[PDB]
From TrEMBL, chain A:
Full-sequence portion shown in this chain: 691 to 1118 of 1197
GO cellular component assignments: host cell endoplasmic reticulum membrane; host cell Golgi membrane; membrane; virion membrane
Source lineage: Viruses, Riboviria, Orthornavirae, Negarnaviricota, Polyploviricotina
Location of the protein in the cell: Host Golgi apparatus membrane; Host endoplasmic reticulum membrane; Virion membrane
Name of this chain's protein: Envelopment polyprotein
GO BP: fusion of virus membrane with host endosome membrane; symbiont entry into host cell; virion attachment to host cell
TrEMBL record, chain C:
Recorded family membership: Belongs to the phlebovirus envelope glycoprotein family.
Record localization: Host Golgi apparatus membrane; Host endoplasmic reticulum membrane; Virion membrane
Full-sequence range covered: 1012 to 1065 of 1197
Organism of derivation: Rift valley fever virus
Coiled-coil parts of chain: none
Name this protein carries in UniProt: Envelopment polyprotein
Superkingdom of source: Viruses
Length: 431, 54, 54
């Protein structure tokens, strides 16, 4: 039902045209400013060629208002379980020495566990001493050795990526319909720009956009929803904190690669002569992920998941009052010489006057061929454009008025021959 | 030695579905290795602080 | 938190009927310890006694 709202004509300073045999195409190279439509309305721009029938339209529909995030710092984390090994070695056998075991390093390779393989995981080498002699199970009276090969591995199946926000960028899901008929859906926020077929569009002035996000961190799951943490972002992974084991990619967590950043002095060791029990103190991320899962309630913003791209949005009320900039980069716009006549008919009218949303109207367009409709009032203040085709449809759009008793004669034309048309309806007063 | 933090540990004797029992333990939020899989904690609101001078 | 990691659990249906009896019922209500109950289970095959209320 919603359609074009703020419809203006482009200036002739950045719009040139040329005729080359019954086909008069026009170029577009410049920057133009137009008022952005409300929730549902479109920011259409009328383009006039060299005559009256040559009229095009650039539909830019506004879905809704969103508050996207600006990702800056992020890392991959998850739950792990230590899987350590043990191999008691007697003295004077192999590489069993008291000075070698007491001064045993972490990343020092050993000939005992040299048969497992040099894997690329979070591994470490440890050594301990026990008892020797015939009373324990060795030859020499010196205490035996205890080589321990500890390596971390992923015990669960999923992973998590913890990120943060620095500012709530007021993102507006703005789809653009080209002149030929192709629809391109993009987004604009703060002052970013995109690449379209006709050129490039960006956001001018931003009214909203509240800050205050560096004191909170978000958690993203591949398929279990989102979450929220009431604690600022942690820089370095200190010992004894949620985030002491971080990686870089998802495969580094699912496969437990050796390129992950971890904190030293974490894997404990409880030697029991022959048995071994290696434990850690890693905080389970699913606990915080479950206690505070989105949606929640923070101050006055409804936190949820963003559509399309992978991000976290925020719902907030308010009207629409920003502007949009249409930057052209040499785009060709052509149109046929002779079009097909059309027949319009009034249907209904219900909405508001002098409002930001604008009243909606529907017309019964009846034609035998494709093209476009071009209608306007008397003083040239309001304009009506609707796509026409073969058959009888009901194209609808948005019209603005400053009187509850709407009664204005329109002149619709799809090929150059205008015809009178009268509309009527009662509107309501709202801001 | 000394104790910088007291971790609340709960010794659990997990019995498998077939009938095999396994005596393990869980502290703070650690995990172990069982036949059916792994087990961990969720809530741990018990601890003793101020043991650095002992 | 019971984290299952793809473990196979098989069981054969159609077990053997049983016949239990009441013994005693002591303990506490709305308490952290929970009241205890004992039953005189008398069966002829290895299985389980799944009892429910109304």
């Amino acid at each position: 039902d919603p359609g074009c709202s703020e419809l203006i004509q482009a200036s002739s300073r950045i719009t040139t045209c040329s005729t080359e045999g019954v086909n008069t195409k026009c170029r577009l190279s410049g920057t133009a400013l137009i008022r952005a439509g409300s929730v549902g309305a479109e920011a259409c721009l009328m383009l006039k060629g060299v005559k009256e029938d040559q009229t095009k339209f650039l539909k830019i529909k506004t879905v809704s208002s969103e508050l996207s995030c600006r990702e800056g710092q992020s890392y991959w984390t998850g739950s792990f379980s230590p899987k350590c090994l043990s191999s008691r070695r007697c003295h004077l056998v192999g590489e069993c020495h008291v000075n070698r075991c007491l001064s045993w390093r972490d990343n020092e390779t050993s000939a005992e566990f040299s048969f497992v393989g040099e894997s690329t995981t979070m591994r470490e080498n440890k050594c301990f001493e026990q008892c020797g002699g015939w009373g324990c199970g060795c030859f020499n009276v010196n205490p035996s050795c205890l080589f321990v090969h500890t390596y971390l591995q992923s015990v669960r199946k999923e992973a998590l990526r913890v990120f943060n926000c620095i500012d709530w960028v007021h993102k507006l899901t703005l789809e653009i319909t080209d002149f030929d008929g192709s629809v391109s859906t993009i987004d604009l926020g703060a002052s970013s720009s995109r690449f379209t077929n006709w050129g490039s569009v960006s956001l001018s002035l931003d009214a909203e956009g509240i800050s205050g996000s560096n004191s909170f961190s978000f958690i993203e799951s591949p398929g279990k929803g989102y979450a929220i943490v009431d604690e600022p972002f942690s820089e370095i992974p200190r010992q004894g904190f949620l985030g002491e084991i971080r990686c870089n990619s998802e495969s580094s967590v699912l496969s437990a690669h050796e390129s992950c950043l971890r904190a030293p002095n974490l894997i404990s060791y409880k030697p029991m002569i022959d048995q071994l029990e290696c434990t850690t103190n890693l905080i389970d991320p699913f606990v915080v992920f479950e206690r505070g899962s989105l949606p929640q309630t923070r101050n006055d913003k409804t936190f949820a998941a963003s559509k399309g791209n992978r991000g976290v949005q925020a719902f907030s009320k308010g009207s629409v009052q920003a502007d949009l900039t249409l930057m052209f980069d040499n785009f060709e716009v052509d149109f046929v010489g002779a079009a097909v006549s059309c027949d319009a008919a009034f249907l209904n009218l219900t909405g508001c006057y002098s409002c930001n949303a604008g009243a909606r109207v529907c017309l019964s367009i009846t034609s035998t061929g494709t093209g476009s409709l071009s209608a306007h009032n008397k003083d040239g203040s309001l304009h009506i454009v609707l796509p026409s085709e073969n058959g009888t449809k009901d194209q609808c759009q948005i019209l603005h008025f400053t009187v509850p008793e709407v009664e204005e004669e329109f002149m619709y034309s799809c090929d150059g021959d205008e015809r009178p048309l009268l509309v009527k309806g009662t509107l309501i007063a709202i801001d």
